Amino acid sequence: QNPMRDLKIEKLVLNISVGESGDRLTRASKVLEQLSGQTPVQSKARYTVRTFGIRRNEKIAVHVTVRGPKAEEILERGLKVKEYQLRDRNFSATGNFGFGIDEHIDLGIKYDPSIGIFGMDFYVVMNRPGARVTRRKRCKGTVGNSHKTTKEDTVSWFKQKYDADVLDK
């Protein structure tokens, strides 16, 4: 019984885990920039491993958060690449979902060898309306069980829209 329990997309965050800092990262950053239109954010390394050749606070990654119609736009632009085919996995038991795509040129974006080719992790966080209770300052509360996102309920929404796919157990 839902006249307002209609599943919107909260945000879509794109993430390039460029394993090191430098030119490669400022390039993946410029890609994210002309994929979002918003200045992306850089991520520093938490600790140091040295097998991955990284260092604490190395600024080894970039991401960008996009919400609304623009997010639906890029979401579809990537769904095409993945042929509208996902798996029973890839979905959080909490309702959200995401995929990954190497070959970032499949998103319309041209080649431009002065930047190279890069991969990207796509993560879509979904939520019904009134999710503001958990994110506001005053009276911050928890949404009812029946009202928050579910994994089966989200895959059902995903299939209904774009009829894309489920594909396995």
């Binding site: 038991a93 300052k137 005053r138 009276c139 911050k140 509360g141 069980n145």
Partner: protein, 296 residues
Amino acid sequence: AFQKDAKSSAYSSRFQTPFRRRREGKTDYYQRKRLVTQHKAKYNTPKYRLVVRFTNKDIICQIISSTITGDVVLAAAYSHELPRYGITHGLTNWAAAYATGLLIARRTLQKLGLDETYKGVEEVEGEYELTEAVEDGPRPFKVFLDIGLQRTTTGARVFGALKGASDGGLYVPHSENRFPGWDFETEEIDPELLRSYIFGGHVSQYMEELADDDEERFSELFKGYLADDIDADSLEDIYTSAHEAIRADPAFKPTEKKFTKEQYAAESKKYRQTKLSKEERAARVAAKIAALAGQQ
């Protein structure tokens, strides 16, 4: 509630619940203590806070003093009271907040005796000033602005209510760096802009900014403004007139009887469900043992 996350008896037992007004994300105690607490060497003089809260599009302005048994309200003025003085729509706007501030200012001043004295500033030019004390006379009433959990941003309606109370006559110690029109880098305030916000220059500018670019959104947004034949030009005067009306009568008279509380109590107890009897649930579980364990 994934079974891998359920809480244990030990967790719940050794768990310490916070204060109710905290669990309800309503009171910032770290702030309440420093606002309420009074100098131990005065020992009865209450610290009067000017609580200003914002319901969804309705302003609340109460003047309280704390008591070991519960805060006592001295004066109370709800922005929804503005119709009486001359404002009908959007009683959430900066000008509405300033209106309520001035309202309570004069209301408490009269409830006290400092009505003729401490009339505040009338010709509001949008200047930065505080209600100064009178030579060889009682010091003005002093209250401290309680914005609750509001996020202090430069130019907010909470500070608009502040400007209203101060202009009304209440002594509210305050700075000017968070009043609309404050220049971030250069240390100069724009009183033309502040006066504008006090009257509606931004809402009025929006009205005549949408009136000739998109009548399709002005259609419903501002619908009532048209439903009552009134455009931007007018706004400054509706507010100024409201100012005169409030300064003339701060009286607060309440709502009519309207189906008195005992009647309300009845028509609501109808929906109020009262707990069951222990014997009731005893039999309510005995019936279940018979209907479930008794081989159907």
